[PDB]
Amino acid sequence: PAAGNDELIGALKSAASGDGVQAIYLWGPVKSGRTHLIHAACARANELERRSFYIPLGIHASISTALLEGLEQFDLICIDDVDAVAGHPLWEEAIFDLYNRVAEQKRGSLIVSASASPMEAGFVLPDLVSRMHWGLTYQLQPMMDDEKLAALQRRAAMRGLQLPEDVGRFLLNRMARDLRTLFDVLDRLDKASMVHQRKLTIPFVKEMLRL
């Protein structure tokens, strides 16, 4: 998503290839691009004929810490939301061991994501947080509101409809603000616009969206 920055893409393309960077640490809000980038890596890994292994550690209660053993045979290991077990000494300890076992072997990489930097994610083992800083850490950028209004206007324009800056802001104060609902409501107001051959205005939008 918003995280199409050159540096980050390189670090990932390298870890997926075992060129290569040992460990990456993505962190950001939801719909920041974490899970997508992780699978993007597993994708390039797969075409380089390097086996990868993904783990959504949000389900840590359902799985055991023994799932990290023998996991090093894989060339690329990805752990989504590793900060989900931050606080559980036993999980951090199994993850700490894994970090050292992937580095122990050659052509081993390790990409993990979280909702906060390694220090603020609230881990209990300094040893683990430090083994994490030995590698790379990137912060994925969350699309702010002003970037949304600008993208919602750029889309409207693509289909020959102008979205007055003030009308688009009225929209951001009524919709859920996520791009699925915003982009969708745009489609609705554009079909409403042609049906009534009326330009988009705040009074008109209110009438169309029952507000």
> Which parts are annotated binding residues?
31-36, 155, 180
Among 25, 74, 96, 99, binds a copy of itself (CB under 8 A): 74
Among 4, 36, 64, 180, binds a copy of itself (CB under 8 A): 64
Using the rule CB under 8 A, is 154 a contact of a copy of itself?
A: yes
Annotated binding-site members for Mg(2+): 35
Q: Is 181 within 8 Å of 152 (Cβ atoms)?
A: no
Using the rule CB under 8 A, is 30 a contact of a copy of itself?
A: no
Report the nearest approach of a copy of itself to the CB of residue 107 (Å).
15
What are the φ/ψ torsions at residue 97 (nearest 5 degrees)? -55, -45
Using the rule CB under 8 A, is 52 a contact of a copy of itself?
A: yes
Nearest of 182, 200, 180 to residue 190 by alpha carbon? 200
Annotated binding-site members for CDP: 31-36, 155, 180
How many of the chain's residues bind a copy of itself (CB under 8 A)?
30
Q: Which residues of 84-118 are buried (b: 16+ CB within 10 A; e: fewer)?
A: bbbebeebbbbbbbbbebbbeeeebbbbbbbbeeb
Q: Tokens 């982009």, residue?
A: 183
Among 36, 174, 191, 198, binds a copy of itself (CB under 8 A): 191
Using the rule CB under 8 A, is 113 a contact of a copy of itself?
A: no
Classified as helix, coil or strand, 26 is: strand
Residue whose CB is less far from a copy of itself, 115 or 193:
193
What are the φ/ψ torsions at residue 33 (nearest 5 degrees)? 125, 5
What is the distance between the alpha carbons of residues 121 and 163, in angstroms, rounded to a whole number?
A: 40
Using the rule CB under 8 A, is 46 a contact of a copy of itself?
A: yes
Using the rule CB under 8 A, is 42 a contact of a copy of itself?
A: yes
